[PDB]
């Protein structure tokens, strides 16, 4: 009746136990229902196939603005925060995004309240209020959102490409919008934005352009009736789907060179080729076949040779989405100092590789290898988190038939050499666009992009250059990839051992290593997680050694890259990085060949031979990387400073780059043996693996280090952990700095409570749960201080507390007063809330903390967190939630009155103020809720001095976990 059709069988992975049913309502809405009787959280998402590409020419950002407004009230639920408040009280969350052709809304919530959430949600598409008052406030949120992107290099380049194509093509539009485009200019032009928002919603939010996906515990039949009851009423305007057959880049936009000045000190080369829309060929993906080859990093690849010449370090190639009717094919690389001088040669090599592909012709075995790999990946796919899953599905329901939505973007079908040749025929010099990003162009540009202010220059590429590229011949160093030897073949799930444990067990406890093990007893997929922490005091003893630890590992990954790329493609991955206590190594994926890769890594780090050239290149990139932190956002600087302030030992970026210039090859080579001579290893092996196999992996790691590095055990007294500074009662310190790039302020306020413990943890978490929603609605929605407004707990070195983070055009001291006013408002709010409401929050937190991992790596991460923090409280959630339910409203009031209130006897407050670029100075104190009077803070002028003048907290005691 209200249903036009019900899908046949929804092809899913055999390992997938969830149930699916696809349907199309009478109004044209495509739906995918998902029943998962085990899910702790239910979720829904609706994707409207309309985006910024459809913004009216005179109101840039209208669709994005519409997106923001839909969260602030509907005819059925007028309360501007009814939606967010409801979700918050029921362990839910929500967000939405706007792209060129889509506006996607989504939320998740306790499985028991799917109906209530979905009802409030459906109203976004039935009776939005677009309240005048909300409109005038929320426009500030949009402006602030754009403001933080202004000095972001990725966004600047994004808009620059649009501004350099056909000006008449909608691809040229500014999609974010700001106060000028959404308020100032419209007012001047006599345009009523409120009307336009309604007109836009009325004209494009049509049921025929919508797709919905719902996931819950309810049966498919019940979910079917629920969806019909709430969405069949959406009106169908029979809106035509926007199409863009003419490519934004026409002839006059090809064979062009762009020289661009970046904000950060980065060096990049972007090569772009216009191509037809390849979306309809998804069954064979000719564009991805070419991306796979051109972007390959194995021996014989384009990258391998460009790196050998010392011209580039990284490369990305393949097709890039555009919109219905047009796409792009790119080849992007970063540049070394030398690579910057050889851009013409680099591009020549690009065409030589492309010519090599043309000469050999399409390779079916390559396609087949990927097809089979994709089949394996789809079959053993990890179970997704509901929210992201529904959002993703709502989006692709627009491109594939109901029955194929789950497989469409995973499985390959037919090899189409003709389509591959057709795309390859478009990758030629005559149709190339080249952009070079480098500080070396500063003062050499003559154009400015209006929306971001990007400085650049445009030149036609000389015909003789085009002609030399067209004559690209074959380069003996370029070869097609060899057969991938890492493809997994053994997928058997070993039977659960009789002595298997529900939590990780300590099966090895020696001075050289401590091994935690757990055989997967929930997911049963042929995968495993091998986590290793290598302790050594020489990884962070001083700035120079921190630099060497980083450089060492970076050089190792770089030398293993060719080898490891193939493994990565075969679903075998690894992460290796230096830490403040040593090194971290993690190998994840199919268990089959993990031992081979792991052995190779350990063997290599212990017998590593540094390439001088690679060493100099990576050192130079690292130097810029440290310097580039100055271009990060204000709130990031704020977080950075707080971290340096509150931790016993922490080397600053400045100390690191100062010590860097003295890292020499000889010094680095001497460093490695020292680093590996003495270590302690704590590991967590979790997955499709046996106790005896675990012991075997650990022994192999030990034996390899002992054999090549002569590694010996470390002394237990050497296993030092850092402490957090202990603030004095009623103390308040302020550290102030300035961000030289962004013209916006940032701030982080930290109210230190006490050492982590069951009671203290839940006191803090319950309070945060309670203020979470009100904090966002007050400081952002109501007061519009900025797009970024955050509150929540802060945990570090066993200590904890409450933190607020804000980025705004308003000065820090004003921001501080607002947070303080809000605290008092939350005070009255809590004292006035009903036991009913209070218990909702307890239950909300309970569900949040008990929501269980849906994939192996998520469960492992939780165990790893306990091991890394050395608290080893694996049954933490049950414990803490049991305690949580004990908490009363009064306990919270007392906790607030003793630790957080402005006149609390145990208030421990530190504030980091980051001033905007255009602020030469600023004080540190100064129809809105009334802000309380604040004490005079002690200004921190030197971080070292600050820490020295305060005591340090002790380290948290470990939760004893008995085992051999």
């Amino acid at each position: 009746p209200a249903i036009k059709r019900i899908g046949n069988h929804i092809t899913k992975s055999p390992e997938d136990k969830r149930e699916y049913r696809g349907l199309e309502l009478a109004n044209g809405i495509k739906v995918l229902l998902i029943s998962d009787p085990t899910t702790d959280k239910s979720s829904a998402a609706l994707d409207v196939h309309i985006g910024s590409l459809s913004d009216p020419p005179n109101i840039a950002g209208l669709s994005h603005f519409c997106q923001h407004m839909l969260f602030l009230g509907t005819k059925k639920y007028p309360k501007e925060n009814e939606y967010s408040q409801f979700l918050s009280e029921h362990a839910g969350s929500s967000n939405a995004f706007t792209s060129g052709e889509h506006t996607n809304y989504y939320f998740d919530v306790s499985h028991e309240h799917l109906e209530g959430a979905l009802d409030r949600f459906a109203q976004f598409f039935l009776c939005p209020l677009f309240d005048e008052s909300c409109k005038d406030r929320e426009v500030n949120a949009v402006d602030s959102e754009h403001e933080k992107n202004v000095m972001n290099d990725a966004w600047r380049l994004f808009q620059l490409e649009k501004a350099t194509g056909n000006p008449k093509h909608p691809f040229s539009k500014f999609g974010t919008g700001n106060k000028y485009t959404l308020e100032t200019r419209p007012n001047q032009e006599g345009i009523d934005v409120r009307q336009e928002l309604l007109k836009f919603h009325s004209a494009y939010y049509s049921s025929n352009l919508m797709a919905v996906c719902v996931l819950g515990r309810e049966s498919l039949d019940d979910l079917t009736n629920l969806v019909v009851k709430l969405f069949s009423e959406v009106e169908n305007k029979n809106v035509p789907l926007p199409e863009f057959p003419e490519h934004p880049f026409q002839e006059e936009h090809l064979k062009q060179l762009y020289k661009i000045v970046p904000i950060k000190d980065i060096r990049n080369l972007y090569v772009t080729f216009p191509i037809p829309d390849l979306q309809k060929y998804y069954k064979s993906n000719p564009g991805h076949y070419l991306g796979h080859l051109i972007g390959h990093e194995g021996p014989g690849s384009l990258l391998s040779e460009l790196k050998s010449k010392g011209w580039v370090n990284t490369l990305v190639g393949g097709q890039k989405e555009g919109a219905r009717g047009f796409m792009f094919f790119i080849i992007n690389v970063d540049l070394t100092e030398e690579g910057l001088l050889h851009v013409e040669d680099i591009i020549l090599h690009m065409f030589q590789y492309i010519q090599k592909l043309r000469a050999e012709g399409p390779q079916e075995w390559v396609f087949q290898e990927c097809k089979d790999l994709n089949a394996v990946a789809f079959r053993f796919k990890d179970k997704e988190r509901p929210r992201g899953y529904t959002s993703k599905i709502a989006g692709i329901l627009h491109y594939y038939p109901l029955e194929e939505v789950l497989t469409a973007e995973y499985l390959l079908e037919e090899f189409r050499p003709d389509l591959i040749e057709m795309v390859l025929d478009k990758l030629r010099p005559e149709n190339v666009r080249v952009a070079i990003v480098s500080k070396s162009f500063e003062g050499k540009t003559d154009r400015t992009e209006e929306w971001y202010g990007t400085q650049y220059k445009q030149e036609a590429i000389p015909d003789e250059v085009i002609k030399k590229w067209q004559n690209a011949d074959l380069n003996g160093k370029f070869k097609l990839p060899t057969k991938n030897e890492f493809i997994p073949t053994n997928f058997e799930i070993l039977p659960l051992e009789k002595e298997a444990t529900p939590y990780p067990a300590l099966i090895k406890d020696t001075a050289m290593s401590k091994l935690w093990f757990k055989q997967d007893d929930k997911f049963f997929l042929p995968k495993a997680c091998l986590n290793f922490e290598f302790f050594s005091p020489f990884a962070y003893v001083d700035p120079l050694h921190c630099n060497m630890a980083y450089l060492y590992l970076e050089l190792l990954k770089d030398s293993l890259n060719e080898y490891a790329y193939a493994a990565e493609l075969a679903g075998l991955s690894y992460d290796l990085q230096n830490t403040i206590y040593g090194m971290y190594l993690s190998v994840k994926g199919y268990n089959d060949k993990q031992p081979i890769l792991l052995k190779k890594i350990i063997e290599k780090m212990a017998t590593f031979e540094i390439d001088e050239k690679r060493f100099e290149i990576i050192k130079e990139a690292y130097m810029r990387s440290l310097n580039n932190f100055r271009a990060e956002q204000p709130h990031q600087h704020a977080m950075y400073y707080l971290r340096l302030l509150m931790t016993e030992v922490a080397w600053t970026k400045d100390e690191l780059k100062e010590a860097l210039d003295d890292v020499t090859l000889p010094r680095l080579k001497a460093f490695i043996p020292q680093l590996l001579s003495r270590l302690h290893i704590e590991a967590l092996l979790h997955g499709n693996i046996t106790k005896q196999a675990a012991l075997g992996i650990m022994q192999m790691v030990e034996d390899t280090l002992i054999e090549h590095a002569h590694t010996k055990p470390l002394l237990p007294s050497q296993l030092v952990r850092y402490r957090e500074v202990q603030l004095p009662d009623r103390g308040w310190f302020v550290y102030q700095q300035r961000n030289e790039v962004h013209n916006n302020c940032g701030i982080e306020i930290y109210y230190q409570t006490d050492m982590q413990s069951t009671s203290e943890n839940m006191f803090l978490e319950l309070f945060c749960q309670i203020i979470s929603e009100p904090c966002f609605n007050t400081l952002r929605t109501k007061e519009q201080l900025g797009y970024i407004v955050f509150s929540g707990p802060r945990r570090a070195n066993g200590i904890q507390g409450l933190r607020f983070i804000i980025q705004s055009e308003k000065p820090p001291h004003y921001l501080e007063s607002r947070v303080e006013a809000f605290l008092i408002t939350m005070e009255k709010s809590i004292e006035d809330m009903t036991e009913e409401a209070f218990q909702k929050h307890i239950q909300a937190l309970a569900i949040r903390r008990l929501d269980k991992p849906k994939k192996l790596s998520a469960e492992c991460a939780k165990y790893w967190g306990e091991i890394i923090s050395q608290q080893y409280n694996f049954d933490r959630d049950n414990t803490e939630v049991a305690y949580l339910k004990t908490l009363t409203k009064e306990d919270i009031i007392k906790f607030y009155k003793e630790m957080l209130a402005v006149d609390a006897p145990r208030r421990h407050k530190v504030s980091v103020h980051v001033l905007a670029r255009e602020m030469d100075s600023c004080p540190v104190v100064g129809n809105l809720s009334q802000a309380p009077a604040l004490p005079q803070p002690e200004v921190i002028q030197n971080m070292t001095e600050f820490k020295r003048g305060l005591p340090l907290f002790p380290l948290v005691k470990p939760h004893i976990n008995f085992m051999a």
Partner: peptide
């Protein structure tokens, strides 16, 4: 290897 969205809130 082988190969911008505006949100309501930064997550």
């Amino acid at each position: 290897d082988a190969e911008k969205l505006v949100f309501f809130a930064e997550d």
